[PDB]
């Protein structure tokens, strides 16, 4: 009693009410410059059970989901999906970049696997370091990221990265980078440096 | 058997500093509970303004959260705190609230300093302590609305038509608040509260 509520992938998929450890908020953003950033960022919904997750997931999937210049974000209740939030400003993200061909084959499965890591508390005590996840749907290639709260907590960040990579099913040859938000916020060429790789 | 704690027991577990030896030293609750907060920030939608603070399922974890948090008396008007059983949202259109209602007490502006904190704590101890015997299963949660015109504390129950459960909870709640017989609490269905018409099914 006082124990973390943890669900594995098989359990979550069998529910497709069971309470979640955290309440989560789904956000939607399109950078439309005729409107201000507060108008463009929309809270879609909040949930705190497995069944309510699945009802929301099924409904968004039936709405031409993952639109072609939009971002979707799932964050713990009380964290805005912007790096300047108190819970994100000292943090960073594990980033998965998908090439054009992978929009057809991997984007849908990889976004779902990320969401199940978050809601299922798959990183043991290091799940407390997770803030949320973001998918950026773009013509040049889609990006999926897990955002974490403290870019100097090496042991939390690397455990999250390695469990995440395992849950995505990526081969050991494919390496993924963690970028500090402070480094991503400064545009310095084609790429941002990786604080860590796994 | 139902896990029931009286007021004296809960109050003895407070500020304890007990060694939770073997993770078996805490006193389990019958239910897991979630504390919610609603902020008055009208620039955001009400959905963005409802936040889950924390969940707990032992007496000692209740007290650690209670001790940490800001008191109701100190909330800016327009804020709400709610304690609900895990899996029930503190909104009337939740499946577990839509056919139910609440026992409501309203406090005047001066009772904020004298009675609001004490009534809110006594309500929380009724909930976590399962003080309504088998009828505790009809309890969804409790809400405190801090407002300029006068504060409101309510116990929400799941089913209007369970007359005996609703009336027993009302009578026990009034006793635990210490209200004189002359001051009454009223029960209103959520469906009736939701319609502004100018509505107590029961009073005790
Ligand atoms: O098909 C989609 C596309 C974008 C977001 C989601 C989603 C639904 C519920 C919770 C979290 C994310 C589903
Ligand atoms: O001082 C307060 C103010 C508002 C809520 C609470 C609370 C704390 C723990 C469980 C339930 C309610 C305490």
Author numbering:
A (entry chain B): 9 to 24, 36 to 217
B (entry chain A): 11 to 208, 212 to 217
Extract from the study:
Eukaryotic initiation factor 4E (eIF4E) serves as a regulatory hub for oncogene-driven protein synthesis and is considered a promising anticancer target. The eIF4F complex includes a core of eIF4E, eIF4G and eIF4A5,6. eIF4E recognises and binds the mRNA 5’cap, and recruits eIF4G to provide a scaffold function for the eIF4F complex, while eIF4A is an RNA helicase that is stimulated by binding to eIF4E and eIF4G8. Here we screen a fragment library against eIF4E and identify a ligand-binding site with previously unknown function.
The biaryl compound 1 binds site 2 in an enclosed hydrophobic cavity bounded by residues from the α1 and α2 helices and the β1, 2 and 3 sheets, plus a loop region linking the C-terminus of the α1 helix with the N-terminus of the β3 sheet. The binding of compound 1 appears to be driven primarily by hydrophobic van der Waals contacts and does not make any direct polar interactions with the protein. Isothermal titration calorimetry (ITC) indicated that the binding affinity (Kd) of 1 for eIF4E was 400 µM with reasonable ligand efficiency (LE 0.36). Initial optimisation of compound 1 focused on more efficiently filling the hydrophobic cavity and growing from the 4-position of the biphenyl to understand the structural requirements for inducing the loop movement.
